[PDB]
Short mmCIF file of C-alpha atoms and ligand atoms in Angstrom, two decimals:
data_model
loop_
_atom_site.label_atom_id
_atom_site.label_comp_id
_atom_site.label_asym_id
_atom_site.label_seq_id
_atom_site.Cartn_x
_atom_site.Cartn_y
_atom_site.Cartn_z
CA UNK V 1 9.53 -23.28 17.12
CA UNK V 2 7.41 -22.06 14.34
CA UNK V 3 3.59 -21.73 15.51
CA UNK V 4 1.02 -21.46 12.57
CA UNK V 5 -2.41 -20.12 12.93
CA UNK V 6 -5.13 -18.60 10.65
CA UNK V 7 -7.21 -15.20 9.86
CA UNK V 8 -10.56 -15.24 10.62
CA UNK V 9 -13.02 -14.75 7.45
CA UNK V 10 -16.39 -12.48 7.94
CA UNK V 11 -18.27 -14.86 5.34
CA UNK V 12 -21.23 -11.76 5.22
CA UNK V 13 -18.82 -9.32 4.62
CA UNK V 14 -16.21 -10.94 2.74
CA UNK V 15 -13.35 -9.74 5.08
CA UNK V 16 -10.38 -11.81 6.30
CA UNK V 17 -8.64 -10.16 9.07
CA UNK V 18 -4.96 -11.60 10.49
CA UNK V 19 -4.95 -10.28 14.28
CA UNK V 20 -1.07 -9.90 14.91
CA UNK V 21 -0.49 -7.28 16.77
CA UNK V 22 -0.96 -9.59 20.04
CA UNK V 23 1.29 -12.36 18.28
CA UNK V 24 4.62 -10.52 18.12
CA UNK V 25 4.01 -7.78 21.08
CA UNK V 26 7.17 -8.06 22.98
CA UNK V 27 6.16 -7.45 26.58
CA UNK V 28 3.94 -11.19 26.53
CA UNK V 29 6.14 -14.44 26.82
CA UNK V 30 5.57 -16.51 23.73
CA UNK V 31 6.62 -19.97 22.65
CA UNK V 32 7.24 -19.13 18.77
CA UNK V 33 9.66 -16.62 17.32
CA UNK V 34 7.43 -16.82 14.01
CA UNK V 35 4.30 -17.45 13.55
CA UNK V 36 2.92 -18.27 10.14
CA UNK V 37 -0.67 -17.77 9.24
CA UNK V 38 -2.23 -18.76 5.74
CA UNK V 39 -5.04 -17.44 3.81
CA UNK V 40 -6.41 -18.04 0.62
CA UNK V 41 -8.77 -15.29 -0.96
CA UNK V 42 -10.62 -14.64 -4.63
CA UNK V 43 -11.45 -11.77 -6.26
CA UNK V 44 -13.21 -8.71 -4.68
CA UNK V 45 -12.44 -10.42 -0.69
CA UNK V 46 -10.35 -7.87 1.36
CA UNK V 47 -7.92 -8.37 3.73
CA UNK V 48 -7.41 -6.42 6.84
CA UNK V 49 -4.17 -6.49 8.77
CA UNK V 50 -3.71 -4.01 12.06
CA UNK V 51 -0.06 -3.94 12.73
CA UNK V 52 1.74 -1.31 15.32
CA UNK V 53 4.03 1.67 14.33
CA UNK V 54 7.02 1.82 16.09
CA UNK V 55 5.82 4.93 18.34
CA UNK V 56 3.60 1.63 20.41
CA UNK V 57 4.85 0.45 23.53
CA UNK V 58 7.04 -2.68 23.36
CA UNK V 59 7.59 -2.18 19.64
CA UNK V 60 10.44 0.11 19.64
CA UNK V 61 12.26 -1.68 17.45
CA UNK V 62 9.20 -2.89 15.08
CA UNK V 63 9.36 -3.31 11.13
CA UNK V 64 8.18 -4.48 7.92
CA UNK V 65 9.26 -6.56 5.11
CA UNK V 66 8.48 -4.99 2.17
CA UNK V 67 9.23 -2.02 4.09
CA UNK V 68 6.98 -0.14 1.82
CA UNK V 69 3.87 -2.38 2.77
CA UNK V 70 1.02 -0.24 1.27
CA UNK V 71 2.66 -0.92 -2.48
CA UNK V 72 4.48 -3.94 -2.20
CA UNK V 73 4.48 -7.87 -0.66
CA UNK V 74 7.15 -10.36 -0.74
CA UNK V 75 7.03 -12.32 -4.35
CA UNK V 76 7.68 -16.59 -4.00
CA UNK V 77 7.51 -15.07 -0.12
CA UNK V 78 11.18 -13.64 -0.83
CA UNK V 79 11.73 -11.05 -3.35
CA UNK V 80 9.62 -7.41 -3.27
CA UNK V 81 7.47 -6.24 -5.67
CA UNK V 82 4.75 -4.10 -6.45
CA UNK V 83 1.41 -5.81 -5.89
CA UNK V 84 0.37 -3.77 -8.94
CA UNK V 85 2.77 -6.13 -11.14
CA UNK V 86 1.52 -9.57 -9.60
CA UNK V 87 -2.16 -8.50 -9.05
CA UNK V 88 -3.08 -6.24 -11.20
CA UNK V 89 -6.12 -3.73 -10.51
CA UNK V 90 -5.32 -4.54 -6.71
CA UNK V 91 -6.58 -1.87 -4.08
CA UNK V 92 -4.51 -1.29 -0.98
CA UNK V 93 -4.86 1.20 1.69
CA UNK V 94 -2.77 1.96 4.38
CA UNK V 95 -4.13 4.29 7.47
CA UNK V 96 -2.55 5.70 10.26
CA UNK V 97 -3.61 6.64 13.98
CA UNK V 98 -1.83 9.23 15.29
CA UNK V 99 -3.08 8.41 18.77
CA UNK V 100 -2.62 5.16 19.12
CA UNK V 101 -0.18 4.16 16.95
CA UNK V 102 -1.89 1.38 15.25
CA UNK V 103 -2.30 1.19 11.14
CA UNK V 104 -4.67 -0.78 9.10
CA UNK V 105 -3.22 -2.62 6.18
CA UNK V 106 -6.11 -3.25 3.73
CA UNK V 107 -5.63 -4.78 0.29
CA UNK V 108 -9.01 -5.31 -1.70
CA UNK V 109 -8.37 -8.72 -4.24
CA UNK V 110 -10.35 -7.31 -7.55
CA UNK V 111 -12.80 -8.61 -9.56
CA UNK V 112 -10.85 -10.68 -11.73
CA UNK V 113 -8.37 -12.56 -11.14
CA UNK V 114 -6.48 -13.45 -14.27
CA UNK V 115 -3.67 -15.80 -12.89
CA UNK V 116 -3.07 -17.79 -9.62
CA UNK V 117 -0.75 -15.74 -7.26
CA UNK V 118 1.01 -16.32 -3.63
CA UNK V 119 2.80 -13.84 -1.87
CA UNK V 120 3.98 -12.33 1.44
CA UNK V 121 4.04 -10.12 4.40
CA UNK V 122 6.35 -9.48 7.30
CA UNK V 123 5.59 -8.07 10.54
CA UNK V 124 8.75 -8.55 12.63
CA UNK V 125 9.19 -7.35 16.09
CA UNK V 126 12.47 -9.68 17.00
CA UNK V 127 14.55 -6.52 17.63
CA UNK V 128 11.73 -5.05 20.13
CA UNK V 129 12.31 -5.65 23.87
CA UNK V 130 10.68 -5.21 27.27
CA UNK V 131 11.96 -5.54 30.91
CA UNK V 132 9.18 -7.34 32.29
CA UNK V 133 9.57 -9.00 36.10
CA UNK V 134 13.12 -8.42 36.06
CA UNK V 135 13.12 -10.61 32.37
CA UNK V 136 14.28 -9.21 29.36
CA UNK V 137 11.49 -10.49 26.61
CA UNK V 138 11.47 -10.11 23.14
CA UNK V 139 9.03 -10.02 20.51
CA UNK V 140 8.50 -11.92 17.53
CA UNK V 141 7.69 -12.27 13.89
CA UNK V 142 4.19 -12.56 11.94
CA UNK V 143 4.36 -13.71 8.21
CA UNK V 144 1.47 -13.92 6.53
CA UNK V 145 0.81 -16.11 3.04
CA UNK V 146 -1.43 -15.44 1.05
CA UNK V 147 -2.78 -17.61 -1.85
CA UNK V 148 -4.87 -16.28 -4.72
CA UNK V 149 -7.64 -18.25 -6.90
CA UNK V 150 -8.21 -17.48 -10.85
CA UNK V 151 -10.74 -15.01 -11.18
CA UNK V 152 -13.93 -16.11 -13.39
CA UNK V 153 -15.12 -13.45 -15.38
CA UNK V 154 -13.73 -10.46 -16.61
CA UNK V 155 -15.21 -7.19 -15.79
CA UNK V 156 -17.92 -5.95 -18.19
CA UNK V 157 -16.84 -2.22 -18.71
CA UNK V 158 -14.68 0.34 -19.73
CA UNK V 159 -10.61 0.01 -19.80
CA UNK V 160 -10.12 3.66 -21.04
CA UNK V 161 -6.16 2.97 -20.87
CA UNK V 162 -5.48 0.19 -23.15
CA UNK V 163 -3.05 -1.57 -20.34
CA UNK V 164 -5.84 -3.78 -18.54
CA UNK V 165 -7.23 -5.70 -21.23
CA UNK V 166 -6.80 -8.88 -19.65
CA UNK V 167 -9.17 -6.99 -16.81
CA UNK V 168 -12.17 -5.86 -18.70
CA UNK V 169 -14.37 -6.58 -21.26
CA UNK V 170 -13.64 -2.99 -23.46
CA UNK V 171 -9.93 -2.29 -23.65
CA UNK V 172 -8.43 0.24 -26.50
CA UNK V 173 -5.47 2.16 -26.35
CA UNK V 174 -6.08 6.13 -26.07
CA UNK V 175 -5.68 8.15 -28.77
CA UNK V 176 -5.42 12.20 -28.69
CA UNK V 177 -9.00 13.96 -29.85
CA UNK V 178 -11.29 11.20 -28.71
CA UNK V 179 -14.60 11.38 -27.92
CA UNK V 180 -15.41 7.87 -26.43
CA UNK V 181 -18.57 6.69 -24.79
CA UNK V 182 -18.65 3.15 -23.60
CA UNK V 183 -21.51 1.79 -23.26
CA UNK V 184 -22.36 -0.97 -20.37
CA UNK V 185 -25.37 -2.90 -19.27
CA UNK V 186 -25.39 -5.17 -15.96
CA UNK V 187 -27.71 -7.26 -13.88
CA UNK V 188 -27.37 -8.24 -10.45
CA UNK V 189 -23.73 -10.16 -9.51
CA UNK V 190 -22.26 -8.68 -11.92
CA UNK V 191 -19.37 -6.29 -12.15
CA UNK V 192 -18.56 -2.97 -13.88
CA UNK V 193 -15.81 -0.80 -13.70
CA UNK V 194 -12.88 1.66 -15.80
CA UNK V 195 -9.42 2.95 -15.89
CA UNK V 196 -8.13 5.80 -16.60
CA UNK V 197 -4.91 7.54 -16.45
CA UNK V 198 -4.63 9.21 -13.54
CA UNK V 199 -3.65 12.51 -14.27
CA UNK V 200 -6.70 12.64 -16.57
CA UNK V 201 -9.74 14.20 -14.32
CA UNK V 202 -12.36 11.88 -12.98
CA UNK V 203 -15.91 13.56 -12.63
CA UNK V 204 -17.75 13.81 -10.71
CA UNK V 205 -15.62 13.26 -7.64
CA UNK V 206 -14.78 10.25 -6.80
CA UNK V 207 -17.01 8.14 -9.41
CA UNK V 208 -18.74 5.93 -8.56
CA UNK V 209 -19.47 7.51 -5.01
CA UNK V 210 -21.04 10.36 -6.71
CA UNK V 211 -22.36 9.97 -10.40
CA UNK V 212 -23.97 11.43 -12.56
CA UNK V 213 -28.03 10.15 -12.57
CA UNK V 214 -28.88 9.77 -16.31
CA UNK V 215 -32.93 9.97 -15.38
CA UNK V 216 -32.05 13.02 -14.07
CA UNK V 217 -30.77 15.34 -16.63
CA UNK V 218 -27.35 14.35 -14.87
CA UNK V 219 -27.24 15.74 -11.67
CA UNK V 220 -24.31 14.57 -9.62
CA UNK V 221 -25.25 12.62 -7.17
CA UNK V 222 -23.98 10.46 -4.60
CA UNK V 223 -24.17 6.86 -5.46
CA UNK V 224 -26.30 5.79 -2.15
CA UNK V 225 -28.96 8.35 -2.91
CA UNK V 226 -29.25 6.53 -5.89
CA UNK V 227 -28.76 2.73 -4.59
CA UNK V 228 -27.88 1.03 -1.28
CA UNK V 229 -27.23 -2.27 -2.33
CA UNK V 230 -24.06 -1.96 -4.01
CA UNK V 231 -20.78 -2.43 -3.49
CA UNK V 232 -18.15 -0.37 -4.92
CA UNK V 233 -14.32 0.55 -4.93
CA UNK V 234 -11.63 2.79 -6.46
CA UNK V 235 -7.87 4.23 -6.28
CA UNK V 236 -6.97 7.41 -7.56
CA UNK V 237 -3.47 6.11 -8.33
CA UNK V 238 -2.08 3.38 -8.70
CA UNK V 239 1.85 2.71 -8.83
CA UNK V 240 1.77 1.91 -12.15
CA UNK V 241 -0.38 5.39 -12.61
CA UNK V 242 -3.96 4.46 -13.37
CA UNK V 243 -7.38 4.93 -11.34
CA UNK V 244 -9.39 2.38 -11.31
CA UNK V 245 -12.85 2.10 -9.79
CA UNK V 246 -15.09 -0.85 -9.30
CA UNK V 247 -19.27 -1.63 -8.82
CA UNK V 248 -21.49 -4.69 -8.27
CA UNK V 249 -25.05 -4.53 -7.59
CA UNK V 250 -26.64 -7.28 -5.40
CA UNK V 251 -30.25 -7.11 -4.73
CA UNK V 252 -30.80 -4.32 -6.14
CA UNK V 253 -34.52 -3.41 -7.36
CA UNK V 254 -34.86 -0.16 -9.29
CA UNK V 255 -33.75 0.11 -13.12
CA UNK V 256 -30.40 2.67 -12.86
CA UNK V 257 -29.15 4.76 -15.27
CA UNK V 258 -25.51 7.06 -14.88
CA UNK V 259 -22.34 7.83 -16.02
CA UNK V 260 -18.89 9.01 -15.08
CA UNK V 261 -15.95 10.42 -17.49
CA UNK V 262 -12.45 10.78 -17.65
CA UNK V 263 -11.55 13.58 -19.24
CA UNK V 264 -8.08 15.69 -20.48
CA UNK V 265 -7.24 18.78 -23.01
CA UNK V 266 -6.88 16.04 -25.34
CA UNK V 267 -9.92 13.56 -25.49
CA UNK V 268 -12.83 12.69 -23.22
CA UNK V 269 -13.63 9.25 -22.00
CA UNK V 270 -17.40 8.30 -20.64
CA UNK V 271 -18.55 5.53 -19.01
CA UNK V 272 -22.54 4.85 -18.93
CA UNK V 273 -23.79 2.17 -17.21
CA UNK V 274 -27.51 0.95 -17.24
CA UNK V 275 -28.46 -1.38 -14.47
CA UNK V 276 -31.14 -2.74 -15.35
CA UNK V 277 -32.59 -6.08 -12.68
CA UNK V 278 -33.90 -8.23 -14.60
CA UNK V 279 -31.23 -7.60 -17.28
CA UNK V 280 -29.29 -11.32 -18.13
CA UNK V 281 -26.15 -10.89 -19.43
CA UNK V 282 -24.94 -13.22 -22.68
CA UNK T 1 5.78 19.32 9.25
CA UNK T 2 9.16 19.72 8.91
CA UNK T 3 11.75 20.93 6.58
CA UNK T 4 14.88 19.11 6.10
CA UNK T 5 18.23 19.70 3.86
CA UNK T 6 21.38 17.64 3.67
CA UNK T 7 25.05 18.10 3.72
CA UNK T 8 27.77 16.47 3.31
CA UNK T 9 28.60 14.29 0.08
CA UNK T 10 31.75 13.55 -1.67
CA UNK T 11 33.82 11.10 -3.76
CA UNK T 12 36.13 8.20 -2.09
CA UNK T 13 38.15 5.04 -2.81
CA UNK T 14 36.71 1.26 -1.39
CA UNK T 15 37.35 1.74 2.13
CA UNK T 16 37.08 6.08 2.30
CA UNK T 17 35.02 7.82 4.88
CA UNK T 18 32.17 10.46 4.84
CA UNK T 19 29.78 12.08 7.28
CA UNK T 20 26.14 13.42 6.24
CA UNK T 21 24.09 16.04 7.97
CA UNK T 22 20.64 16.87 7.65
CA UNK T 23 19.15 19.66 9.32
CA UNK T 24 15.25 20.33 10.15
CA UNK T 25 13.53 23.49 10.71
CA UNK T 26 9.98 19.75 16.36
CA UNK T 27 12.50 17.36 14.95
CA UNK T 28 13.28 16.28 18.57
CA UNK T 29 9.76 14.35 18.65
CA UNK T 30 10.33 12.78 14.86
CA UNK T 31 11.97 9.46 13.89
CA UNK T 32 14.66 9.82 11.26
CA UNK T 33 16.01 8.08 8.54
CA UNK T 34 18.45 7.76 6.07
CA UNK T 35 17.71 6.39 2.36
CA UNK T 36 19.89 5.25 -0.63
CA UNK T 37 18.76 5.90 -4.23
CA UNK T 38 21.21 4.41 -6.77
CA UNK T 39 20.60 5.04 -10.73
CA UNK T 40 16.75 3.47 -11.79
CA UNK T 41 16.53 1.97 -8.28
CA UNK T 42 13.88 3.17 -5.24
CA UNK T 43 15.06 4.88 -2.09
CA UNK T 44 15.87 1.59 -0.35
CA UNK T 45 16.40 1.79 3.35
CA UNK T 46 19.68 2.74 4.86
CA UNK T 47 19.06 3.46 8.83
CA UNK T 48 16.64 4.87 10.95
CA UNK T 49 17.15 6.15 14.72
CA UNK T 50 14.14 7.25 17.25
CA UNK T 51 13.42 10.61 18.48
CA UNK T 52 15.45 9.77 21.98
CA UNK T 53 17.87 7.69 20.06
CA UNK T 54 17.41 4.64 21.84
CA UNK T 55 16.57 2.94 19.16
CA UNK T 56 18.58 2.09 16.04
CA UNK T 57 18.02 0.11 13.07
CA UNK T 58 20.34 -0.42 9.78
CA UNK T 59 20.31 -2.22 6.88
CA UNK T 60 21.25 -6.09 6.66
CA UNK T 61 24.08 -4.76 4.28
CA UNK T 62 25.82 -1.81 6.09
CA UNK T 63 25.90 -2.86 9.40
CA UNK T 64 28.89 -2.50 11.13
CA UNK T 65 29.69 0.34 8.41
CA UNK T 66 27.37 3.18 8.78
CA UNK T 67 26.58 5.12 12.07
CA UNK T 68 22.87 7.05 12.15
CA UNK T 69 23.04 9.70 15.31
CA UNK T 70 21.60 12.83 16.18
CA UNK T 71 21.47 16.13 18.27
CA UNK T 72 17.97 17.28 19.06
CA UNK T 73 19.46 19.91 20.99
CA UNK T 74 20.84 21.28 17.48
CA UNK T 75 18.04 19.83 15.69
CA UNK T 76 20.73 17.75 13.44
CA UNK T 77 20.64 14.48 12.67
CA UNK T 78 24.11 12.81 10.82
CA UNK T 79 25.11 9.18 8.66
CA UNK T 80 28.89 8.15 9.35
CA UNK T 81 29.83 6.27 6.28
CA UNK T 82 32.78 4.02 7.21
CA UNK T 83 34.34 0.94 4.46
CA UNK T 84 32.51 2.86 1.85
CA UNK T 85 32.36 0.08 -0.65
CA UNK T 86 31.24 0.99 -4.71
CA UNK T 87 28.02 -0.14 -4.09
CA UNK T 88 26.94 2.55 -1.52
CA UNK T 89 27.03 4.34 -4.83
CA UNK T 90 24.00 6.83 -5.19
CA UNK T 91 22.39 9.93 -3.73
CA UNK T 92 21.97 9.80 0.05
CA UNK T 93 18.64 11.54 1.58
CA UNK T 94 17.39 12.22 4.81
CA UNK T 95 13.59 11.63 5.75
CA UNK T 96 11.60 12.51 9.23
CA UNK T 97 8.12 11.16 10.27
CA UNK T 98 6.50 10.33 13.12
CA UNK T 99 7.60 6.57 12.98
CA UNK T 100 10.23 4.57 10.78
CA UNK T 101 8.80 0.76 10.69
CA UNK T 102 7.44 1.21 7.27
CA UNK T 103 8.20 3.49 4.41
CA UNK T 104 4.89 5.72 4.96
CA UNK T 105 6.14 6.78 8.47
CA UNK T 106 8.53 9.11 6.28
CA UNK T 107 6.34 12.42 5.21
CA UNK T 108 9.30 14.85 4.96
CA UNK T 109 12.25 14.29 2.59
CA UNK T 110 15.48 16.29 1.87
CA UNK T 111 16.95 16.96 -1.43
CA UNK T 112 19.50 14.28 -1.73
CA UNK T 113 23.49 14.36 -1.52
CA UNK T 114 25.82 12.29 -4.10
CA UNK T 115 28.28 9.84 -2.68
CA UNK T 116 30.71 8.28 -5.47
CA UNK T 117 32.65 5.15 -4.32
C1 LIG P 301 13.38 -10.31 11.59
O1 LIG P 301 14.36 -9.33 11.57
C2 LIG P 301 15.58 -9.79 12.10
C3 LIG P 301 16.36 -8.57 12.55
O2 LIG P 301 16.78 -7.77 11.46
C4 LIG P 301 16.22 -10.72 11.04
O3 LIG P 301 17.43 -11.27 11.50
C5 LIG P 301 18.49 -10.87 10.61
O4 LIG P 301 18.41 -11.54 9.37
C6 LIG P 301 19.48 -11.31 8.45
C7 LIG P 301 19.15 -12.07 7.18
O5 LIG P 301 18.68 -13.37 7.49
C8 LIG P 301 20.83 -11.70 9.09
O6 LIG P 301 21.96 -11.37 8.29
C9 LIG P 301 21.01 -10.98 10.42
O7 LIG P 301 22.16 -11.41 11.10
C10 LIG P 301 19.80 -11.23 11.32
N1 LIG P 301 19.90 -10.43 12.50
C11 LIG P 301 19.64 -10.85 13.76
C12 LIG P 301 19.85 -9.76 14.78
O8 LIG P 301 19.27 -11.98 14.05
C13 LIG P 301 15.27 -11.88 10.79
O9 LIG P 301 15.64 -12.68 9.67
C14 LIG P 301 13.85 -11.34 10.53
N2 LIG P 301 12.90 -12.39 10.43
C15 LIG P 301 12.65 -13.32 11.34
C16 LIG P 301 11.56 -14.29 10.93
O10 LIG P 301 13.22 -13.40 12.41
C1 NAG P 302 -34.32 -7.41 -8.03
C2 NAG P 302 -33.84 -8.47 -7.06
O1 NAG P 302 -33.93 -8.30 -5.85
N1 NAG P 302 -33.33 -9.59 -7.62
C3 NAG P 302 -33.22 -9.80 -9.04
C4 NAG P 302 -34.35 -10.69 -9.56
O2 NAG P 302 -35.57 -10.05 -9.26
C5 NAG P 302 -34.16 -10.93 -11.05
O3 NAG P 302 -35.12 -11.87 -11.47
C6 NAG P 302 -32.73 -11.44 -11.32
C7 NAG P 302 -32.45 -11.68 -12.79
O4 NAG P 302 -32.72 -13.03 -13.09
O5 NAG P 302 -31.77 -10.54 -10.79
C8 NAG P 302 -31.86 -10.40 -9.40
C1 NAG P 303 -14.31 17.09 -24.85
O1 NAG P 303 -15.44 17.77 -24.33
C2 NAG P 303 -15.31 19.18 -24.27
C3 NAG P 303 -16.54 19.71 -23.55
O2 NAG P 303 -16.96 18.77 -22.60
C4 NAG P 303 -15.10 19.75 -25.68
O3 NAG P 303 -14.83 21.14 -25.66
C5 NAG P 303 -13.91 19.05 -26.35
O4 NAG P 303 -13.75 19.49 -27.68
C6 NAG P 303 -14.08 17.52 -26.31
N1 NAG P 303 -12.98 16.78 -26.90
C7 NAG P 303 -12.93 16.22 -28.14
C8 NAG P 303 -14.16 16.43 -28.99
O5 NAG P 303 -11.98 15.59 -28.58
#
C-alpha cells in the first residue's frame, strides 16, 4: 500500500511546502508504509520541507536518504548527488530547532533553469516505533519527487567565475590583476545576479541585502532602505565553492542605482546594476 | 561543544577483528556516530547510537558486522569491527551532535583512525 498525495503551492508567494512530518509519525496508525508526493517547480519557486530530528518523540529511529539532505537529493530517485551538479546555482538551507526538534529543508529553484531535472528525497521513519494502547506501531516513509521545467532566460549579470556561463548573460574566466566592472541594466521581471569564488570577499556584507547606493556617493546600505519590492537571494558557499546571489524587481517605481564587488589580493570584481522602470530590455 | 579523539586502528586479513574508541571531553546527552572515509570518497555513514543507547542504526552494508556501543559513565563511545572485509578500507572517525538522522546533526568530529583490510 503506497498512498500518494501532493504539496500545497502558495501561488502569491511562490512556495510549495510537503507537510510530512504527520505522514510518517509513528505513534498514528496509518494505512501506507510510503507515501509518495509529486511536485513540479520552475525557476526561482522554493520548496519547504519540515521534517523531525531524531531527538522528536516517536522518531527515535528517524532518517534521511541522502543522508546529507542540505547538499544532496537522490538522482533518477536512486543514486546521490550534489544538487549543485544537477541544478546548478541551486540555494538550499537547512535550519535547526533546538527546542523542538523540527528542521526546515528549503531549496530555492534559480532563475534559470538550463535543463529539465527530476530528483528525490527520503524521509523514512520505518525503524521508529511507539507502544500505543498496548500496540506496537510503526512509522513510515515520505518520498518526495520533484520535477523541474527549462528555465527561459538567462540571468542578465555578472558570472565573475567563468564556471556558470550557461547561467548568466556575462561569463569570463578570472584572471590575476583584474580590474573588472560589469555593467547591468534591468527593468521590472527581470533578473540580475553574480558569482564569485567564495573565498574572494563580498562587500558590503551580504550583497545584495546591503549595497552600495550609487546616488549616494556609495554608502552601504541595506537593500530595503533602498527598495521594498524586490526579491532577492544568495549563498555564501556553495559545494562546488562559489557565492552566488540573486535580484528581481517587481513593481518597483524609483530609478536605482548600486553596486557590489568581489574582491581578492589579486583582482577586483564589481557589479553595478541600474534599475531603471521603464527600462525594456532587447 | 565537545571534543572528541579516536583510538584504535590497525591492519587485518578478510575476516580480522578491531575495536575503535573515541573519547569526548556532556557526551552522555549527544548522539554518536561512526563514519568511513575511503581514498577520494565522502565520510559515508557507518553507525550511529542515541545518547541512552536505545537506539541503533547501521549501514545497509555492515550489518551484522560492526557493533556501535557506548559508556556515558566513562564518556566513551566504541565500533566493534567483526568480518572486516577489504572494502571497510579507509580512515574511521567518530562524530557527536545533538541528533544523527541527517549528516548536519554531526557538529563535532575526531581526527580519524586507519583501518587496512
Ligand atoms: C526505509 O529504511 C528501511 C530501514 O533501513 C529500508 O529497509 C531496508 O532496505 C534495504 C535495502 O532495500 C534492505 O537490505 C534492508 O533489509 C531493509 N531493512 C529493513 C529492516 O526492512 C527501506 O528500504 C527504506 N525505505 C522504505 C521506503 O521503506
Ligand atoms: C513602475 C511600475 O510599477 N511598473 C512598471 C511600468 O510602470 C513600466 O511601464 C514597465 C515597463 O514597460 O515596467 C513596470
Ligand atoms: C583592487 O583595488 C584596490 C583598492 O580597492 C587596489 O589597491 C588594487 O590595486 C586593485 N587591483 C588591481 C588594480 O588589480
Amino acid at each position: 500500500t503506497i498512498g500518494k498525495d501532493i504539496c500545497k503551492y502558495d501561488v502569491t508567494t511562490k512556495v510549495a511546502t510537503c507537510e510530512i512530518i504527520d505522514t510518517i509519525d509513528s505513534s498514528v496508525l496509518k494505512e501506507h508504509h510510503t507515501v509518495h508526493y509529486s511536485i513540479t517547480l520552475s525557476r526561482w519557486d522554493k520548496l519547504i520541507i519540515k521534517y523531525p530530528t531524531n531527538e522528536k518523540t516517536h522518531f527515535e529511529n528517524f532518517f534521511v536518504n541522502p543522508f546529507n539532505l542540505k547538499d544532496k537529493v537522490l538522482y533518477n530517485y536512486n543514486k546521490p548527488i550534489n544538487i549543485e551538479h544537477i541544478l546548478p546555482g541551486a540555494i538550499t538551507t537547512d535550519i535547526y530547532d533546538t527546542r523542538t526538534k523540527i528542521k526546515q529543508y528549503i531549496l530555492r529553484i534559480p532563475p534559470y533553469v538550463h535543463k529539465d531535472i527530476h530528483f528525490s528525497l527520503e524521509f523514512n521513519n520505518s525503524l521508529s516505533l511507539t507502544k500505543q494502547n498496548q500496540n506496537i506501531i510503526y512509522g513510515n516513509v515520505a518520498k518526495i519527487f520533484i520535477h523541474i521545467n527549462q528555465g527561459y532566460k538567462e540571468i542578465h549579470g555578472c558570472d565573475f567565475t567563468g564556471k556558470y556561463s550557461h547561467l548568466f548573460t556575462y561569463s569570463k574566466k578570472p584572471l590575476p590583476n583584474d580590474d573588472d566592472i560589469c555593467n547591468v541594466t534591468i527593468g521590472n521581471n527581470t533578473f540580475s545576479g553574480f558569482a564569485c569564488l567564495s573565498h574572494f570577499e563580498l562587500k558590503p556584507n551580504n550583497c545584495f541585502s546591503s549595497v552600495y547606493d550609487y546616488n549616494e556617493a556609495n554608502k552601504v546600505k541595506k537593500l530595503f532602505d533602498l527598495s521594498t519590492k524586490v526579491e532577492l537571494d544568495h549563498i555564501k558557499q556553495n559545494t562546488s565553492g562559489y557565492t552566488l546571489s540573486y535580484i528581481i524587481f517587481n513593481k518597483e517605481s524609483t530609478k536605482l542605482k548600486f553596486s557590489c564587488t568581489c574582491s581578492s589580493n589579486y583582482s577586483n570584481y564589481t557589479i553595478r546594476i541600474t534599475f531603471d522602470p521603464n527600462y525594456i530590455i532587447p | 561543544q565537545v571534543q572528541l579523539q579516536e583510538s584504535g586502528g590497525g591492519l587485518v586479513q578478510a575476516g580480522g577483528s578491531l575495536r575503535l574508541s573515541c573519547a569526548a571531553s556532556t557526551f552522555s546527552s549527544y548522539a554518536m556516530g561512526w563514519f568511513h572515509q575511503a581514498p577520494g570518497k565522502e565520510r559515508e555513514f557507518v553507525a550511529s547510537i542515541s545518547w541512552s543507547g536505545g537506539s541503533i542504526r547501521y549501514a545497509d552494508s555492515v550489518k551484522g558486522r560492526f557493533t556501535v556501543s557506548r559508556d556515558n559513565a566513562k564518556n566513551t563511545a566504541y565500533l566493534q569491527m567483526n568480518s572486516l572485509k577489504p572494502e571497510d578500507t579507509g580512515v574511521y572517525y567518530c562524530a557527536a551532535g545533538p541528533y544523527s538522522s541527517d549528516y548536519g546533526g554531526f557538529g563535532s568530529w575526531g581526527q580519524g583512525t586507519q583501518v587496512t583490510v
